[model samples]
Structure formats: C-alpha cells, structure tokens
Target: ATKAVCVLKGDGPVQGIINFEQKESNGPVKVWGSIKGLTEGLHGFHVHEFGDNTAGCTSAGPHFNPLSRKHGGPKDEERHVGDLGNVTADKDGVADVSIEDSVISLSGDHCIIGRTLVVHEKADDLGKGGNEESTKTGNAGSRLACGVIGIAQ
Candidate 1:
C-alpha cells in the first residue's frame, strides 16, 4: 500500500506533503515531498517520536530513535531511524525533495507510520556540531513545523 504524510505549521509559513511507496518488504522506500514557507537555505528534517501535534511542534517529542542510536545523517548506518538529514530551501522559500531510504519502514518496529515529521528552524549539524545535543537532536533549533504520518488509501 502507498503511505502518505503531510506537514503543517502552528502559525507560521510552513506546509508540505510527503509520500512513500514500498515495492518490496526488504527494498528501499521511495520518498518525495515539497515544502514551502521556509527561509532560504537548509533546514533540519526528521521523523519524530510522536504523532501528537496538539500542542504544536514541541508536542512531538524527540527524534525517532528506536534503536537508541545516536543522531547522524540519513546515510549513516549507526544513526537514529529518524535522522533524515537536511532539506535545502530555495531563495523563494520552497524546497522539493526526492530520495530513497532503506532505513525507514512502513510497517513493523522501524515503521514511520503514526509518527511525526518535523522541520526545524536551523540546519541540522548532523551530529558534528561538537555539542551534546548534536548527538541527540542534531543541534537543530526550534521546531518550526510538524505533522503526523498517516496511511494512504
């Protein structure tokens, strides 16, 4: 089945939709999305631990680290399951992303379904910021926008 998720800001200018499709149980999942209303440059992007956005972005808890791993880039084998790296926005405050990830799953323990997706105010240092929070949250600043992951019909 195809799975889809959308991002929304509490009272700011951030909104987007992310789509996922899994062709095989052990295959990489195709991910694509477009986000708008961001400052020109990079922003921290990741899957969070909760689906609750009732209290705004902060309600989503920390990043999805089911394996209790440290935060790293999306390609890092020893990183958290939610460390999806950064998304660069254009001068027009828009960002379009397309990538395939073998770490995220649509089902089972590592599944991203029912989780939250967050966009941070600052760029994620990718665990190289030399700070303690870097390994836990990538040093990503304030949560600017967030949304819950949901299944698609």
Candidate 2:
C-alpha cells in the first residue's frame, strides 16, 4: 500500500490536514480530510502541478494533467489526474471530505507525492458545459487554500 499526507493552510481562514491511502498499487485512493473556514457551499478540490507555495496558493500552477486530458469530474474518464471533484461545507463552514478515486495513483508513474492539493473558493462545474473555461478548469474560482503532498510512514 502507499500512504501520504497533506496539511492544508492559507493566509485567510481555511485550514486542515488530509490523509491519503491506497490498499494496493492499483487500488483507488482513499482520502479523509477535514477543512474549516469555508462558506456554506461546495468547493473545488484538486492536485496541482507543483508543491511550491512561495507565491501563495497560485504558485501551484494548473491542475496535474500529465496525460493532457480535458477538465472533467472525478467520475469522468476524460478528466485530469488531479480532478478529485468538490468538497462541501456545512452551515458552520466546516467540510468533511472523504473520497475514493481510481484515476489517481499512489504509486508508480502517477504518484501524487510532492504535488499541491488546492481548495478553491467556488465549486467545480466538473466540465459539464462545453465552454472553453469549463474544459480548462471547470470554471472554478479563486484558490483559497493549498498544501503539499508528501510520503508518510
């Protein structure tokens, strides 16, 4: 199995930590995360290309799309490797995110260690529309928080 960890942080009000685990090299990734300080709505969650946050959350660059695929939802086979979909916050501005994704690998070529996990201010449209922005970034808005993924014991 492969395991990883990410501690989400932002200059604003968002914060949390996440745990990633895979039962086997080829198994779906299981993630458990708790996030706070978000509005009562859905937010986009993704793995960006870089771990560098020197210039804040934007430094992570675009979604991790080594396969050059279109921006699709987590359930779509045409999506980017980083497109894990959205996390919803309750009225109290807290979000509990638990996801099982087969498109992202925890080992081998598609491993996610050293990348950036970003939390967006807006929910991802999941590329539902055929617009240009939809296919590029699901039309998700500003990045509110981010963290770097790393190997864990």
Identify the runs in model 2 with alpha carbons over 4 angstroms from their true place.
none
Off by over 4 Å in 1: none
Q: List the residue pairs that clash in candidate 1.
A: none
Model 2 compared with the native: what TM-score? 0.96
**1-153: candidate 2 lDDT, tens digit per residue:** 388989999889999888999978888999997999999899999999999999999999999999999999999989999998999999999999899998887887778889999989998999986688999899779888899998888
Candidate 1 on 1-153: residue-level lDDT in tens? 456666566568888887778778677878888889999899998999999878888889999999899999998887988888999999999989887889988888888988888988989999999989988899889888888888876
Backbone clashes under 3 angstroms, per model:
0, 0
TM-scores, each model vs. reference: 0.95, 0.96
Total clashes in model 1, counting residue pairs 3 or more apart in sequence or in different chains: 0
Model 1: lDDT equals 0.85
- Quote the lDDT for 80 in model 1: 89
